[PDB]
Amino acid sequence: GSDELYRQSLEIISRYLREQATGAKDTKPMGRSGATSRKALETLRRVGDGVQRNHETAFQGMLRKLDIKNEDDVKSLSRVMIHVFSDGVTNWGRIVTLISFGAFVAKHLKTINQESCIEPLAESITDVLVRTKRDWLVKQRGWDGFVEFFHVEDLE
């Protein structure tokens, strides 16, 4: 059919959010463009987890403002993501931060209700990221650029 970037993006983001909220790995290895997707998810695990560790108290403050002012967290999160990019600056650091915060929201939703699904949150994040930054993502080689940007090439 069509739109491999959207599919691939949604699979990487859905699984990361699903792992974080539940604490379990999907197993279910690969499918379609697995090698890039496998390395992107592992990069997202390393960086995503680190961002949430390093800015945990800040995320709690954002979460509180998110809950109090408006009803739906997924709709509200979309407003935030658009505003984040409203200055016209786009880079992988911002993209990974938004995904990391989405994972934070996903945990929060599973705590207030254990049966909540993560798909609406993930597809909404993927919607913002793919639609609004389609050509930019393509220019960075999609998730291959994401992997490399966050890949440390010399430990020394």
Binding site: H83, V84, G93, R94, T97, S100, F101, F150
Partner: peptide, 23 residues
């Protein structure tokens, strides 16, 4: 305004991430 305040904090976090990469 709540949207700006949240976006501002994410931008600061993202800038932190970018500074880490090229160090």
């Amino acid at each position: 305004q709540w949207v700006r305040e949240i976006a501002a904090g994410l931008r600061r976090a993202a800038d932190d991430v970018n500074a880490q990469v090229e160090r």
